[PDB]
Amino acid sequence: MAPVLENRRARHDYEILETYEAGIALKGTEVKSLRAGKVDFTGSFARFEDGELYLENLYIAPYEKGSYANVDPRRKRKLLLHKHELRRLLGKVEQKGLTLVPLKIYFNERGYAKVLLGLARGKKAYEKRREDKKEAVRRALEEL
RNA sequence: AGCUAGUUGGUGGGGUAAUGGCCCACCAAGGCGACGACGGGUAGCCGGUCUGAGAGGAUGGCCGGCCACAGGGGCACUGA
RNA sequence: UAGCGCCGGCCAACUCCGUGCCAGCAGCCGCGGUAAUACGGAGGGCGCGAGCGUUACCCGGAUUCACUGGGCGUAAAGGG
RNA sequence: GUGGGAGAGGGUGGUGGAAUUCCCGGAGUAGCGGUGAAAUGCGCAGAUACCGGGAGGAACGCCGAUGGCGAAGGCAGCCACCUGGUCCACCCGUGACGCUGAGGCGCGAAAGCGUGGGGAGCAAACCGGAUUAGAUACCCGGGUAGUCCACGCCCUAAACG
RNA sequence: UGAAACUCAAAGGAAUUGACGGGGGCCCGCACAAGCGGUGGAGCAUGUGGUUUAAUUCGAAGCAACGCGAAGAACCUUACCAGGCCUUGACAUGCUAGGGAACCCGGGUGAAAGCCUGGGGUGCCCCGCGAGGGGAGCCCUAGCACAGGUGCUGCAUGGC
RNA sequence: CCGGGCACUCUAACGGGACUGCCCGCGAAAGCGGGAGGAAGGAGGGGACGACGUCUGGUCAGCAUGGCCCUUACGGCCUGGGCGACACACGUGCUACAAUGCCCACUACAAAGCGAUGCCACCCGGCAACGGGGAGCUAAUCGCAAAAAGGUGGGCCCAGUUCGGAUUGGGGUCUGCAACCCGACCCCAUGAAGCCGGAAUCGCUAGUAAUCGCGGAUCAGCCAUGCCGCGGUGAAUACG
RNA sequence: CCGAGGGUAGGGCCCGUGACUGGGGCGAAGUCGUAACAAGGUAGCUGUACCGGAAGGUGCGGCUGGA
RNA sequence: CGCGGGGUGGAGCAGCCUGGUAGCUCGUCGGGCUCAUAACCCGAAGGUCGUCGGUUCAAAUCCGGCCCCCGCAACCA
RNA sequence: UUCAUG
RNA sequence: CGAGCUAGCCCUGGCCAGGGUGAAGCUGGGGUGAGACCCAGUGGAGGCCCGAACCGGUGGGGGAUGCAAACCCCUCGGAUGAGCUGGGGCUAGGAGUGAAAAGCUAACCGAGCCCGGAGAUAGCUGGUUCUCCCCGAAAUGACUUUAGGGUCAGCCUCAGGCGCUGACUGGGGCCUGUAGAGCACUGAUAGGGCUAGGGGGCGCCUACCAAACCCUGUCAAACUCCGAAGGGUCCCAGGUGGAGCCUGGGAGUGAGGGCGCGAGCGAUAACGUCCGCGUCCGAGCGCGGGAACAACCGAGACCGCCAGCUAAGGCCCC
RNA sequence: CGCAGUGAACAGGCUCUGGCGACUGUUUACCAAAAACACAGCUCUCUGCGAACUCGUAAGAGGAGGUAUAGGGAGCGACGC
RNA sequence: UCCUAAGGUAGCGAAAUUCCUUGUCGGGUAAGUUCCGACCUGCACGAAAAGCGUAACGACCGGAGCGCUGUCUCGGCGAGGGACCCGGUGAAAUUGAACUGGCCGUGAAGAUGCGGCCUACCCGUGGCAGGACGAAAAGACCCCGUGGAGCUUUACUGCAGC
RNA sequence: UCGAUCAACGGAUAAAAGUUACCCCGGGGAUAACAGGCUGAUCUCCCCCGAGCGUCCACAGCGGCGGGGAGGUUUGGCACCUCGAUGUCGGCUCGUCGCAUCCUGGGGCUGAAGAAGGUCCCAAGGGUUGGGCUGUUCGCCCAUUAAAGCGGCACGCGAGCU
RNA sequence: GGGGGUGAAACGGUCUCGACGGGGGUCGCCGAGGGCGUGGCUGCGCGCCGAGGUGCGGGUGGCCUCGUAAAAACCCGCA
Ligand SMILES: [Mg+2]
Ligand SMILES: [Mg+2]
Ligand SMILES: [Mg+2]
Ligand SMILES: [Mg+2]
Ligand SMILES: [Mg+2]
Ligand SMILES: [Mg+2]
Ligand SMILES: [Mg+2]
Ligand SMILES: [Mg+2]
Ligand SMILES: [Mg+2]
Ligand SMILES: [Mg+2]
Ligand SMILES: [Mg+2]
Ligand SMILES: [Mg+2]
Ligand SMILES: [Mg+2]
Ligand SMILES: [Mg+2]
Ligand SMILES: [Mg+2]
Ligand SMILES: [Mg+2]
Ligand SMILES: [Mg+2]
Ligand SMILES: [Mg+2]
Ligand SMILES: [Mg+2]
Ligand SMILES: [Mg+2]
Ligand SMILES: [Mg+2]
Ligand SMILES: [Mg+2]
Ligand SMILES: [Mg+2]
Ligand SMILES: [Mg+2]
Ligand SMILES: [Mg+2]
Ligand SMILES: [Mg+2]
Ligand SMILES: [Mg+2]
Ligand SMILES: [Mg+2]
Ligand SMILES: [Mg+2]
Ligand SMILES: [Mg+2]
Ligand SMILES: [Mg+2]
Ligand SMILES: [Mg+2]
Ligand SMILES: [Mg+2]
Ligand SMILES: [Mg+2]
Ligand SMILES: [Mg+2]
Ligand SMILES: [Mg+2]
Ligand SMILES: [Mg+2]
Ligand SMILES: [Mg+2]
Ligand SMILES: [Mg+2]
Ligand SMILES: [Mg+2]
Ligand SMILES: [Mg+2]
Ligand SMILES: [Mg+2]
Ligand SMILES: [Mg+2]
Ligand SMILES: [Mg+2]
Ligand SMILES: [Mg+2]
Ligand SMILES: [Mg+2]
Ligand SMILES: [Mg+2]
Ligand SMILES: [Mg+2]
Ligand SMILES: [Mg+2]
Ligand SMILES: [Mg+2]
Ligand SMILES: [Mg+2]
Ligand SMILES: [Mg+2]
Ligand SMILES: [Mg+2]
Ligand SMILES: [Mg+2]
Ligand SMILES: [Mg+2]
Ligand SMILES: [Mg+2]
Ligand SMILES: [Mg+2]
Ligand SMILES: [Mg+2]
Ligand SMILES: [Mg+2]
Ligand SMILES: [Mg+2]
Ligand SMILES: [Mg+2]
Ligand SMILES: [Mg+2]
Ligand SMILES: [Mg+2]
Ligand SMILES: [Mg+2]
Ligand SMILES: [Mg+2]
Ligand SMILES: [Mg+2]
Ligand SMILES: [Mg+2]
Ligand SMILES: [Mg+2]
Ligand SMILES: [Mg+2]
Ligand SMILES: [Mg+2]
Ligand SMILES: [Mg+2]
Ligand SMILES: [Mg+2]
Ligand SMILES: [Mg+2]
Ligand SMILES: [Mg+2]
Ligand SMILES: [Mg+2]
Ligand SMILES: [Mg+2]
Ligand SMILES: [Mg+2]
Numbered sequence A: 001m002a003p004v005l006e007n008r009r010a011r012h013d014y015e016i017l018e019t020y021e022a023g024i025a026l027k028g029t030e031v032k033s034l035r036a037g038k039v040d041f042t043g044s045f046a047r048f049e050d051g052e053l054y055l056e057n058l059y060i061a062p063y064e065k066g067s068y069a070n071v072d073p074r075r076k077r078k079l080l081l082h083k084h085e086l087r088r089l090l091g092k093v094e095q096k097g098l099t100l101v102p103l104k105i106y107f108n109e110r111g112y113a114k115v116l117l118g119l120a121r122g123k124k125a126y127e128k129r130r131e132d133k134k135e136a137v138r139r140a141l142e143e144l
Numbered sequence B: 001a002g003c004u005a006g007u008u009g010g011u012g013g014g015g016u017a018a019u020g021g022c023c024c025a026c027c028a029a030g031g032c033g034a035c036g037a038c039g040g041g042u043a044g045c046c047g048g049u050c051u052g053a054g055a056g057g058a059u060g061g062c063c064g065g066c067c068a069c070a071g072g073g074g075c076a077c078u079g080a
Numbered sequence C: 001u002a003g004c005g006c007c008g009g010c011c012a013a014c015u016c017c018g019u020g021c022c023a024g025c026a027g028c029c030g031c032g033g034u035a036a037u038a039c040g041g042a043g044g045g046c047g048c049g050a051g052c053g054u055u056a057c058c059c060g061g062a063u064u065c066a067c068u069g070g071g072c073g074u075a076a077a078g079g080g
Numbered sequence D: 001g002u003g004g005g006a007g008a009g010g011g012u013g014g015u016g017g018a019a020u021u022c023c024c025g026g027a028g029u030a031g032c033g034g035u036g037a038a039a040u041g042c043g044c045a046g047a048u049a050c051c052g053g054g055a056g057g058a059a060c061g062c063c064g065a066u067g068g069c070g071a072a073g074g075c076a077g078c079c080a081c082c083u084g085g086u087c088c089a090c091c092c093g094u095g096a097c098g099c100u101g102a103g104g105c106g107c108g109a110a111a112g113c114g115u116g117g118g119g120a121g122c123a124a125a126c127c128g129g130a131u132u133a134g135a136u137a138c139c140c141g142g143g144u145a146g147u148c149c150a151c152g153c154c155c156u157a158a159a160c161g
Numbered sequence E: 001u002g003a004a005a006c007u008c009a010a011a012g013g014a015a016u017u018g019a020c021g022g023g024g025g026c027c028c029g030c031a032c033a034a035g036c037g038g039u040g041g042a043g044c045a046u047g048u049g050g051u052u053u054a055a056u057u058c059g060a061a062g063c064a065a066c067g068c069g070a071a072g073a074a075c076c077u078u079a080c081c082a083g084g085c086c087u088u089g090a091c092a093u094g095c096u097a098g099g100g101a102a103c104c105c106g107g108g109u110g111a112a113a114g115c116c117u118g119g120g121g122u123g124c125c126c127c128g129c130g131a132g133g134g135g136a137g138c139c140c141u142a143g144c145a146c147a148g149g150u151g152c153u154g155c156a157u158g159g160c
Numbered sequence F: 001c002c003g004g005g006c007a008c009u010c011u012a013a014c015g016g017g018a019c020u021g022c023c024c025g026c027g028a029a030a031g032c033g034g035g036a037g038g039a040a041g042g043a044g045g046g047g048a049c050g051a052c053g054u055c056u057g058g059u060c061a062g063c064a065u066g067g068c069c070c071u072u073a074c075g076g077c078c079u080g081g082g083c084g085a086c087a088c089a090c091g092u093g094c095u096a097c098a099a100u101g102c103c104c105a106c107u108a109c110a111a112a113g114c115g116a117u118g119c120c121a122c123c124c125g126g127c128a129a130c131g132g133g134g135a136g137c138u139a140a141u142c143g144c145a146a147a148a149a150g151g152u153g154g155g156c157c158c159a160g161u162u163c164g165g166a167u168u169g170g171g172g173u174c175u176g177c178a179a180c181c182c183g184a185c186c187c188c189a190u191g192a193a194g195c196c197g198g199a200a201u202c203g204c205u206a207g208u209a210a211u212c213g214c215g216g217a218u219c220a221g222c223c224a225u226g227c228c229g230c231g232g233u234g235a236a237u238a239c240g
Numbered sequence G: 001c002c003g004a005g006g007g008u009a010g011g012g013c014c015c016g017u018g019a020c021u022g023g024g025g026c027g028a029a030g031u032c033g034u035a036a037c038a039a040g041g042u043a044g045c046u047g048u049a050c051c052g053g054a055a056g057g058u059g060c061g062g063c064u065g066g067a
Numbered sequence H: 001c002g003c004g005g006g007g008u009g010g011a012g013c014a015g016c017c018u019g020g021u022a023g024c025u026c027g028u029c030g031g032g033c034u035c036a037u038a039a040c041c042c043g044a045a046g047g048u049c050g051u052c053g054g055u056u057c058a059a060a061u062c063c064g065g066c067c068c069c070c071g072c073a074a075c076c077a
Numbered sequence I: 001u002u003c004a005u006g
Numbered sequence J: 001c002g003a004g005c006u007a008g009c010c011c012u013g014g015c016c017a018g019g020g021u022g023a024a025g026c027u028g029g030g031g032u033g034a035g036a037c038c039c040a041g042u043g044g045a046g047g048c049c050c051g052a053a054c055c056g057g058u059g060g061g062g063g064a065u066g067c068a069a070a071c072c073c074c075u076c077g078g079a080u081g082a083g084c085u086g087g088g089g090c091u092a093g094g095a096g097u098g099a100a101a102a103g104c105u106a107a108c109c110g111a112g113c114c115c116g117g118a119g120a121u122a123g124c125u126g127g128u129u130c131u132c133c134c135c136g137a138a139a140u141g142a143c144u145u146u147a148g149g150g151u152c153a154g155c156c157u158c159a160g161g162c163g164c165u166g167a168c169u170g171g172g173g174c175c176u177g178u179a180g181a182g183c184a185c186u187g188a189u190a191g192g193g194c195u196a197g198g199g200g201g202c203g204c205c206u207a208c209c210a211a212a213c214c215c216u217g218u219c220a221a222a223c224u225c226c227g228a229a230g231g232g233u234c235c236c237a238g239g240u241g242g243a244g245c246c247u248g249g250g251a252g253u254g255a256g257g258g259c260g261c262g263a264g265c266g267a268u269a270a271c272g273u274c275c276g277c278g279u280c281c282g283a284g285c286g287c288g289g290g291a292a293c294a295a296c297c298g299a300g301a302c303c304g305c306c307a308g309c310u311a312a313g314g315c316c317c318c
Numbered sequence K: 001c002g003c004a005g006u007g008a009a010c011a012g013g014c015u016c017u018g019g020c021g022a023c024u025g026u027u028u029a030c031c032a033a034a035a036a037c038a039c040a041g042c043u044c045u046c047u048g049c050g051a052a053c054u055c056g057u058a059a060g061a062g063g064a065g066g067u068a069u070a071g072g073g074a075g076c077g078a079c080g081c
Numbered sequence L: 001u002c003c004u005a006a007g008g009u010a011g012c013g014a015a016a017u018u019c020c021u022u023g024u025c026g027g028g029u030a031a032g033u034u035c036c037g038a039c040c041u042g043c044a045c046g047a048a049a050a051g052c053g054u055a056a057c058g059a060c061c062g063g064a065g066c067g068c069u070g071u072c073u074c075g076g077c078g079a080g081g082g083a084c085c086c087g088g089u090g091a092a093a094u095u096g097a098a099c100u101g102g103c104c105g106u107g108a109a110g111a112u113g114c115g116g117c118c119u120a121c122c123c124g125u126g127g128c129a130g131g132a133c134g135a136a137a138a139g140a141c142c143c144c145g146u147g148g149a150g151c152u153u154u155a156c157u158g159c160a161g162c
Numbered sequence M: 001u002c003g004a005u006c007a008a009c010g011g012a013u014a015a016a017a018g019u020u021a022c023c024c025c026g027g028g029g030a031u032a033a034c035a036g037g038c039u040g041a042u043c044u045c046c047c048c049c050g051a052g053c054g055u056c057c058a059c060a061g062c063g064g065c066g067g068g069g070a071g072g073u074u075u076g077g078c079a080c081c082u083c084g085a086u087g088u089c090g091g092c093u094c095g096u097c098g099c100a101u102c103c104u105g106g107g108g109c110u111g112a113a114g115a116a117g118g119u120c121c122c123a124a125g126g127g128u129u130g131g132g133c134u135g136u137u138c139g140c141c142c143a144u145u146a147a148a149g150c151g152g153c154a155c156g157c158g159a160g161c162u
Numbered sequence N: 001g002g003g004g005g006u007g008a009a010a011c012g013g014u015c016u017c018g019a020c021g022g023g024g025g026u027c028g029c030c031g032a033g034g035g036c037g038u039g040g041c042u043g044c045g046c047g048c049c050g051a052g053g054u055g056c057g058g059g060u061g062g063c064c065u066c067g068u069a070a071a072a073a074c075c076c077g078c079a
């Protein structure tokens, strides 16, 4: 029921080489909050641990109908890919120096949520500032 | 930014070791106030101490002087 | 018995490793994004040493309340 | 003080023409208006332009300026009245009467407000026309308060040299 | 008349060098204008985006990437994917060392590579009519340092 | 083709020639407007040439290279596939959409080139691509080679056509161990879209644009219509 | 009589708090316009009034820190 | 609870005439412009016409009736 | 003389 | 005809005890250049304040055939004003007057009262006065500005004429399409088999997820291949009865109701409502039973009788 | 001197707020006195005087022996905005 | 984006207006459907049928405190005038006759009167009011009347006036 | 032969709309609102079947889908008495009754260790509070209580009152 | 206290919009996770009972030798 979400800083931070419509296996209740918009990806990507992907460190609120049936909210959820795609990205992590970041969590005609993963390079826009006068002149005094 | 009505002054007392509205009677309208009265906040004050180039700024612990307090407040007695 | 601070500049004393805008540092400027003399450790150094640092407070720097010792066109400031 | 001087200094009272609008009459005919270009609008109900007469309001072209006066605001047709400031000369008189001034008091553009009056132009608001993505704006048509007078308040300003 | 809380490490004045201007002046270039022929319409070729894919290798991204690196992709190229495989290896040597030392011929398994496999067997250092032994190139085995990377980073770089 | 021979065109060295050099007008001078002679004019026309630096431009995938990472794999070998896929979009080009055009024949006219495991003359065979002999060339000597557009005179008759040549089927030749993904051509069928193009946009100031072919590179073949060069015909306009 | 203290009633000053609200600072590369600085594409700023989501616009006047 | 009024493109709406002839703005997709997004320009495309049953040759059109939405009433006691 | 933003 | 109440106005008289606040002025002072202004005093202003008379009537209580067809008590509002009030006067009926309520206008005003038209009209309610005897309804249809009324027909009576025709029955002959029942049609249908179009991957393909057929099942007011009881009509008969048919006079009635049966509406509710066939009450509750009780059961009251037999119902007593 | 001194009688309960109406008034005689009506004030409109308007068939009268700062009507109802 | 002539401005705002509604928060109270202050998805405020304020004022209306109290928990006592007794004068509305019990039924559907039972000597006086569908007013609400008025109007038709 | 949405269609006028809470008259229980009645759809109660819960186990407690009643207190339906009047909501006052019980007294089961409680059977003899808000019955609360009963009696009660 | 409504969207008809692991099943040859294997093929099969060996030997039970009976230490302390 939720619209397309946004990984705001990752869309505006990492260069998206290509995408995948991945999948998430929700571990039992973390559904309606993601169906109402409670998701914040800041400090999260999708990390493998030697066989499979987990969407790491994603904070979703435990739903308030479960008065005591809450879940640890920022966890590593079992992401879903294909198997050749999965071992492909498992290779590509060590081939190219990537980081695998989500872009959105959008729903399909089966009424399911799919986390749109995407590749990174870094998109290094960070300006290493040119040297001010009071360091260039003491480097020049060293050069004297 | 006005304040004060024992407030300001006199006379006559009373009390005090003693002057004094220190307190009481009667009369007189006075006393104070932008040189900061009144109200509020803060504060023991000073020799000093610290700092400062000096002027000054801060501070008043210990030591020394003085006031005030002795659970808060009032009150006299005794006695120099 | 020798420790504590500090080593980007101010401020005396610099390399390596680990970290990768994270963990963290910080008094200001700012460092941190994969070669970090600014973070964490080691080496080395510097300062002080039974102390070294931090904090708060005060004075100095602050000529930044200017009496010594500032200004007022445009900088804050001329009153219509 | 004596003699003058210049001045949009201020206030009162008149007064003059141009121009705008409106009215009235004469003529007039298919448009005028408007912009960068248009439409809105005004117009065959005789509009625009043109002539003549009248009303009435406001500002005063040229002179006129890099001018003058005023303490500041400001102040501009001309006349008269009342009146301030200021300057020159004479060196005539007073004999330091001086200067600045917190608080005061007065003046204080323009806007604004009150009570009347006046209302021609201009014109916030407002309505329309385009404009533009949108336009609450520029541009254009209209259009009230206001602008104006008198009294009375407001008392700010890039009240700046 | 006129605060503080809180916040900022600046706010700001003049001036300089630039950049910019829907600012000016002057001057220019196929920049416009004047022309002629095109593209965009169509079919194809090639390159690219995207999608697909097991992979559709990667890089280039306004001008200044897009008939470009690619002045030759059936395999080679090929870096990619799939599968068969090999491990100090296609290679550069250099060491310890039983071995074979230069090398030729095939057979079998196999998609090929690879792996398994049998017949001829070295002048020379040499003391040699001697048994031969130290032992010099090269080559295979077991190892060693290492080779290798079209893996990343052209904001760490040279070069261009 | 030579016998005689080099006159020339040429070839490729070395030289000259063009500099405001002359003269006039303007002008302080530089220089400008013009003229003459010259083959040429006021940088004669083109190249190569691209400053200090910017875009933290591009390339670690041409190489070199610091750093980090893989080291029975991210290395290495091979077979096969892909790099060519396709719902579409884009960029650059090519052919087109015709009668100034197209088809067949015939005859001209270039420079630049490039070739001993190559270019292949000239025959024979095959309509043809090509195949079998084989001449010459170590190449101003032989070859690619035909030049095309032009011209000649025959066709077509404004027609989606004798325009167009995409597509698809069939017959084949070469290269290569190998043409199915995916080669090039040849031939015979096929004959589509397309009848000058939206909003926009590009190229060009003289041998330029336009049109036409040729060569080369890499290369077994080739994707080539691309690129790099060469010449043939050869404009309009630039008021400003 | 005065008298500390207590009460009552009403003042003053200061402080905490108060649904809600007006603004203010400050966040993350939010939305919305483009007001300013270039004749900021309507010269700007200010007084004041009115209006307008909003910067702002317009009127009257000033100023030049505009031509 | 009863009247009457709508249902039409992603949304907002014209409509559709006895039934046969369906569109408009914005949005959309592709292009063009732009350094890039806006804006603007060019090509189209999109709809079981509220479901359902009815007479009809044929329904979106006309007749019912049912579901959502709108506007009304729900008065006298 | 038009025309908003990174 | 009334403004003798009241509402307003005109003229002319009256009335308002007493206190209190302290306005403008005026006087003096402060101030200033002059003032504005600010103090004190003085003054006496007011739809000013408290408050009696007076006017009014706010809240409550009493009163309620009262003391009174508006009162009394307590409490209140105004009380020098838009005041109150005496006298003299004006205005009058769709008109006056109104500080507005449609209030007031002679004790009841959305149009006074009195007389007259006028014995208005009343589809309405009431009421209708002696006796006996005979016969005796209806509450239905059509139409109504009609629904409580009326016209006509139906039912009723009277008189006359006609003379077995009448209700009822028997015999015949028909008509019809209800109850039943059945799928022959129009539809709805349940299970199984067969098999056209969509759904599972869809190339032929896969469960009654699905037409027609097919056996077996059913249902219908708007279905009938059938279809009775009956009912209607005609004829031939029985039928002498407050039977009929016709003409004329007089009507009443057109609010019906219960019960039974057939149905509708409702809920397979109502002493519900609307019909059809009756019946009964209406008008027979007059009587018996039902405990009582119009319509249930029995039965049609001319009168009498201290006779009898009986119906429904009873038989222990009441 | 009383418990008590307007010693009896007459003789205000007050405050905080909020609505509505500015206020004082006036009304529904005889169930409503109010948040109604009026009210000064505000604007609109009409009327140049044989005035509009009103009453009356007409004269005539009110208007008014008034004259736009005046009358008639309508609305709102002090004041502030 | 459609419609309009135009889409409600300021100021108010669950209101004398808010249906849902006791909106939802606050405040007061122990507890507050009312009150006050707020927020405003205002069925349906809103600018001279004026809007929002407003000091004074009000026999207005709403809500709180304080004081005081028989208003009340919850009543009590006492006086006076009636009431009650006696003497005097002595009305009234109403009235079918009444020799007028209660309950279960029943009946025009709410009985003293009918049936069954159960109580019950005849007659008063003072009382309370439950019944006699008590009285009063030929319902004042509703309906019918082809009634009647008042009033309105872009009902119809006239007339005044113009 | 033509002029009728004279369609209110056997056609009142050739021509006609509203309102009355300012009302008035004649009438009606022919015709409503209150109440009663008949009914019992709805409402309240208990009653069957028992899927299914209740870890297990239909039944301690529950009880789908459905069914059968009772009671007349709700909202109604019907219009039968009353419109020549049956005064009408609530409160006060006084009560009285029913049981389908809220306590209290008994008791059964219990998923009843004890204390509690739940549910069901008997059981009206006695109770069943004081407040805040609202006109309120009813509710929401406040503080209690052993419990703060559900009703009827013309939604008891106005010839008793407000 | 009841009526309405959702707390993943065709008034049914499918699938984890496809994939990830966790459960189970299918397919094959890969010959082997395990193994009955299985016949063309192709033997004389060598363990007891035993003692010993390298530079001064605790180790090392057959890591080797060998039959009327006897041979070498592949490593460890290693002055
Ligand atoms: Mg940064
Ligand atoms: Mg940086
Ligand atoms: Mg710096
Ligand atoms: Mg002493
Ligand atoms: Mg003293
Ligand atoms: Mg100092
Ligand atoms: Mg003390
Ligand atoms: Mg003490
Ligand atoms: Mg002493
Ligand atoms: Mg140093
Ligand atoms: Mg970290
Ligand atoms: Mg540190
Ligand atoms: Mg690193
Ligand atoms: Mg480092
Ligand atoms: Mg300091
Ligand atoms: Mg200092
Ligand atoms: Mg000084
Ligand atoms: Mg400044
Ligand atoms: Mg200044
Ligand atoms: Mg003047
Ligand atoms: Mg001057
Ligand atoms: Mg002198
Ligand atoms: Mg002004
Ligand atoms: Mg004003
Ligand atoms: Mg003014
Ligand atoms: Mg517009
Ligand atoms: Mg004004
Ligand atoms: Mg001023
Ligand atoms: Mg100002
Ligand atoms: Mg100035
Ligand atoms: Mg100035
Ligand atoms: Mg431009
Ligand atoms: Mg094209
Ligand atoms: Mg084309
Ligand atoms: Mg690419
Ligand atoms: Mg390029
Ligand atoms: Mg290939
Ligand atoms: Mg290949
Ligand atoms: Mg080896
Ligand atoms: Mg880096
Ligand atoms: Mg570079
Ligand atoms: Mg040249
Ligand atoms: Mg590298
Ligand atoms: Mg790379
Ligand atoms: Mg290299
Ligand atoms: Mg490899
Ligand atoms: Mg390629
Ligand atoms: Mg092309
Ligand atoms: Mg041709
Ligand atoms: Mg060549
Ligand atoms: Mg040959
Ligand atoms: Mg050659
Ligand atoms: Mg040649
Ligand atoms: Mg073209
Ligand atoms: Mg164009
Ligand atoms: Mg070539
Ligand atoms: Mg190529
Ligand atoms: Mg953020
Ligand atoms: Mg601006
Ligand atoms: Mg701007
Ligand atoms: Mg601008
Ligand atoms: Mg402008
Ligand atoms: Mg400027
Ligand atoms: Mg505004
Ligand atoms: Mg602005
Ligand atoms: Mg404006
Ligand atoms: Mg459409
Ligand atoms: Mg729609
Ligand atoms: Mg009503
Ligand atoms: Mg333009
Ligand atoms: Mg623009
Ligand atoms: Mg923006
Ligand atoms: Mg008379
Ligand atoms: Mg009067
Ligand atoms: Mg005086
Ligand atoms: Mg007085
Ligand atoms: Mg008075």
Ligand SMILES: [Mg+2]
Pocket (backbone or CB within 6 Å): J057
């Ligand atoms: Mg009275």
Ligand SMILES: [Mg+2]
Pocket (backbone or CB within 6 Å): J076
């Ligand atoms: Mg009084």
Ligand SMILES: [Mg+2]
Pocket (backbone or CB within 6 Å): J077
């Ligand atoms: Mg009074």
Ligand SMILES: [Mg+2]
Pocket (backbone or CB within 6 Å): J051, J079
């Ligand atoms: Mg009084």
Ligand SMILES: [Mg+2]
Pocket (backbone or CB within 6 Å): none
């Ligand atoms: Mg009289």
Ligand SMILES: [Mg+2]
Pocket (backbone or CB within 6 Å): none
């Ligand atoms: Mg009247």
Ligand SMILES: [Mg+2]
Pocket (backbone or CB within 6 Å): J110, L149, L150
């Ligand atoms: Mg009347």
Ligand SMILES: [Mg+2]
Pocket (backbone or CB within 6 Å): J093, J094, J111
């Ligand atoms: Mg009358």
Ligand SMILES: [Mg+2]
Pocket (backbone or CB within 6 Å): none
């Ligand atoms: Mg009569």
Ligand SMILES: [Mg+2]
Pocket (backbone or CB within 6 Å): J117, J120
């Ligand atoms: Mg008559």
